[PDB]
């Protein structure tokens, strides 16, 4: 569970970009295809995303890097699936 998000705020020092990054990660985990990077403790996707933010293994840059790597993998796999 979560009580305060001060650690997440100090790791992403804007208090507004934290909300957007956590929403992006939680939407990646909720639809989601992806799986949590932290041991889930019967927490919902937003809380898991914030707990990942606390550990410093997720931020905006890491999410963008992973998204572009996944886009490159999708481009490659479709390339060899057709031609």
């Amino acid at each position: 569970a979560r009580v305060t998000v001060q650690d997440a705020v100090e790791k992403i020092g804007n208090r507004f970009d934290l909300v957007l990054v956590a929403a992006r990660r939680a939407r990646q985990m909720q639809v989601g295809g992806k799986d949590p990077l932290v041991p889930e403790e019967n927490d919902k996707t937003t809380v898991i995303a914030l707990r990942e933010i606390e550990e410093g293994l997720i931020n905006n840059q890491i999410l963008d890097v992973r998204e572009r790597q996944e886009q490159q993998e999708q481009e490659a796999a479709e390339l060899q699936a057709v031609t």
Binding site: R15, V19, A23, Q30, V31
Partner: protein
């Protein structure tokens, strides 16, 4: 009193008022100011578009919540279209110019 979804008014597709009518709480003007004082731009947007008077937006939001996906299509409130029609019903041509 409490309400998830119920009836909506005719002129503006916003939830009814009161509890004798299964109505919704009025997130008034000062509550909008209070959300603006925070950084809650998405909470306010879902408050005044999806949860109040975006007919397609609210139907899609209900379907998404039942599907387990918490995400909203913003849309445009119907009361703004009503205001546009009422101002256009005077001798005043008001329009939303192209992007």
């Amino acid at each position: 009193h409490a309400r998830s979804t119920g009836s909506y008014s005719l002129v503006t597709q916003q939830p009814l008022g009161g509890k004798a009518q299964f109505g919704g709480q009025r997130f008034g003007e000062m509550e909008v100011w209070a959300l603006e004082a925070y950084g809650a731009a998405y909470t306010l947007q879902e408050m005044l578009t999806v949860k109040s008077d975006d007919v397609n937006g609210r139907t899609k939001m209900y379907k998404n919540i039942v599907d387990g996906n918490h995400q909203m299509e913003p849309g445009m409130p119907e009361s703004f279209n009503v205001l546009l029609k009422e101002i256009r019903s005077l001798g005043i041509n008001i329009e939303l110019e192209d992007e």
